[PDB]
């Protein structure tokens, strides 16, 4: 897409904040100044974090942008980014962007940051198998199936999501830095073959068991597994319970809505040293 004749900035970039960003990038004096296509072709980087941008309409006319910093705006749609064929680095933290499929043709994209966007569905990222860095912290993701295709990732953050099933990571042996804190992970076996890890974070899991019936003498199998499948010993057990491997046991003369236990296990994978820590909650049916 091109502007055939020089046109005022504010006619191309409908968002007042983004028009000012373009003006400043080009060292123009006002958003009413005319811009040429050649001037737009010369934009290779935009830094516009925390700028109150609600839309990047008009950015489609910037074919050569390689780095886009748009953290902390009010974006809800990234359709105008879809044909930015040279984009290599994209930062979109703290927006509300969910149309990840809009990125599918960005085949030079190496780094993508989408933290705190309210994302659940990441299936559109399947179209970016060349990605080297992916940051999806602080979202509401449960299903990371498609990440089994992202075999060029060396850095991946999924911290602070709702993930229990990390099997899709098992084959991603290029991973070096892997951030998985604050999920629902109880089973590390998917990580066992990640021999190139240097950084691994496994803090503060919440592992939620399927409800079972309350009984006065409760017996709950421990399902927390290390990378070799061995059971991780609980360190702290609620309600005066005790561990008799492989079961946690409680005497509950009165109904209570849940019992729980907490575990902590140092783990080494590759060169990475991690602390796998979590709470298992067992809800009880009265």
């Amino acid at each position, epitope marked *: 897409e091109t502007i055939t004749v020089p046109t005022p900035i504010k006619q191309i970039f409908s968002d007042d904040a983004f028009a000012e960003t373009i003006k400043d990038n080009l060292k123009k004096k006002s958003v009413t100044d005319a811009v040429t296509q050649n001037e737009l072709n010369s934009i290779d980087q935009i830094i516009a974090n925390n700028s109150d941008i609600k839309s990047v309409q008009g950015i489609q006319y910037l074919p050569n942008v390689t*780095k886009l910093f748009l*953290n902390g705006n009010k974006l809800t749609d990234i359709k105008p980014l879809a044909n930015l064929k040279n984009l290599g*680095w994209l930062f979109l933290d703290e927006n509300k962007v969910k149309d990840l499929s809009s990125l599918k043709d960005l085949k030079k994209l190496k780094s993508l940051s989408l933290e705190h966007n309210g994302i659940s569905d990441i299936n559109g990222l399947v179209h970016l198998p060349q990605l080297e*860095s992916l940051y999806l912290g602080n979202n509401k993701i449960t299903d990371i199936t498609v990440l089994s295709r992202l075999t060029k990732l060396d*850095t991946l953050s999924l911290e602070d999501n709702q993930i229990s099933d990390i099997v899709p990571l098992a084959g991603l042996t290029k991973l070096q830095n892997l951030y998985l804190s604050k999920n629902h992970i109880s089973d590390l076996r998917a990580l066992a073959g990640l021999k190139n890890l*240097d*950084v691994l974070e496994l803090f503060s899991q919440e592992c939620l068991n399927k409800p079972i019936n309350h009984q006065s003498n409760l017996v709950v199998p421990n399902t927390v597994k290390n990378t070799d499948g061995s059971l991780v010993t609980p360190e702290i057990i609620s309600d005066d319970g005790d561990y008799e491997k492989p079961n946690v046991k409680w005497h509950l003369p009165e109904f209570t809505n849940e019992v729980s236990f907490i575990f902590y296990q140092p783990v080494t994978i590759g*060169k*990475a040293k991690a602390r796998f820590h979590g709470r298992v909650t067992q809800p009880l049916k009265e």
Partner: nanobody
Amino acid sequence: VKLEESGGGSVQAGGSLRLSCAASGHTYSTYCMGWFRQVPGKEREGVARINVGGSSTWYADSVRDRFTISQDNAKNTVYLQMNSLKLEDTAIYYCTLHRFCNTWSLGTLNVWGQGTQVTVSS
């Protein structure tokens, strides 16, 4: 996040200097820390980094065999040993940090220290 810089100074070409940088306040469990350098007016450039809490390092092509970066993870401090210093190494060296090393390399999103003068003379 606050970065405290130490070291630097002036030394004759071929000599050695050391730089230190300590991170304090609200540090992540692991993070990227190291230095960029800049001659006044000229473009800043990455020098060396290390993943504090891991082990991976990176060096600019021009320093790769003369400089060594290390960490004291317990002190949240990194160290740069600068050997065989050249006139071209004269610059202000800025400690700088980002949670993720691949982003650290860009500079743009980093936390920055105030800068330490390094001067190499003939």
